[PDB]
Amino acid sequence: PVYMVYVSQDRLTPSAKHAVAKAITDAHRGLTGTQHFLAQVNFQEQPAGNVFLGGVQQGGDTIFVHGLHREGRSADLKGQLAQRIVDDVSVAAEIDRKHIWVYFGEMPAQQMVQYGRFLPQPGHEGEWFDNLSSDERAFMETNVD
Amino acid sequence: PVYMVYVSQDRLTPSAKHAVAKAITDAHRGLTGTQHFLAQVNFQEQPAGNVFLGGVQQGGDTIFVHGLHREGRSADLKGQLAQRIVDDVSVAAEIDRKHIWVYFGEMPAQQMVQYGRFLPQPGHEGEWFDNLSSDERAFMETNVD
Amino acid sequence: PVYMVYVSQDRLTPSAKHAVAKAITDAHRGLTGTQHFLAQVNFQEQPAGNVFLGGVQQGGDTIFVHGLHREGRSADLKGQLAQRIVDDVSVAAEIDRKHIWVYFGEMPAQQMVQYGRFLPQPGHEGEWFDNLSSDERAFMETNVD
């Protein structure tokens, strides 16, 4: 997956960003089985005041997670995952749940590329990973926290 | 919905940002019935020159609106909504309509979370809201212009 | 199309951004037949360290391309275009392909607006073009490198 995380500048320190990324990644792996190294968290910071709710300019305490996923998972699983991202980001960012928005979009795995390779269908990550070259496998394994 | 609005840095004053957010939110509310406070406009600013059209570097005048919506509305209504966004953002930002791109993407409401809660299906926002806890309604209600 | 290109601040010089934009635009035009001026490349820069893979903070050498397209093309074609974007961005940005992620999302052309006009279905770009006013055609024609 790629989780785009839209937050205000300086609302998350580097250690908070790290904690948030770990919480989202742990949730994704925990509920889908996808290896840690296949989950990206991409923080997009903007000055406070660039978010409007109902036309009302907001302070710096809002977070929008746009998760981009492969098609093929059940609505039940996606609901569980969205709920866990809400719960665990709330803890990691020390932010009330009312300030968290989470949207999941899905695309065919056949039009999703990670580490320069096309993704497998959900659930087939082990066979896919075993089929990768030694260097590729080693390079991915550097991305596990 | 969440409207990601990609603009150049300093192209929009705070007042023009407020105006553009109001134009989009009013258009969404007017055409869908969804309450003002359920519409987020999220400005993403980048330095002028980061936009290319046909490989040609642009100045700071281009606007791309990526609207993220729940599934369930008609193609007829979605066309009316995108046209109104083009028309009203053009006025609010004082930008010629030719500089405006607008893309709508849709997701099942079951995988969309706002204010920490999953959204209802389109058209059921009234009873959804009435059934939220009193502190959640109060928090939401403030985001109205 | 709109290709959102997420990169670290300072990783691409102005010339490298031009080269990457041209490589993506030339890949899209070459494989879909859509004219150059209908392809936007939109660079989104963030400070290095805002990207995490598997919970691990990354340096400045990662690229995520989010291509937003009309529905209607085959999986085979989308695969070739994703692969060519990987290959040609690798060259243009001087970045190993293992650092490149590319996701394609699709929407109905009927809810996609460019230059203030609704897009036609894939393959019908020629006829769509010469039916716009000459002022709209003239404005688009400049956006060709």
From TrEMBL, chains A, B, C:
SUPFAM superfamilies assigned: Tautomerase/MIF (SSF55331)
Residue ranges annotated for the Tautomerase cis-CaaD-like domain, each copy included: 1-128
Domain of life where this protein originates: Bacteria
UniProt cross-references to InterPro entries, sorted A to Z: Cis-CaaD-like, Tautomerase/MIF_sf
One Pfam family linked to the record: Tautomerase_3
Binding site for (R)-lactate: 28, 70, 73, 114
Name by which UniProt lists this protein: Cis-3-chloroacrylic acid dehalogenase
Gene: cis-caaD
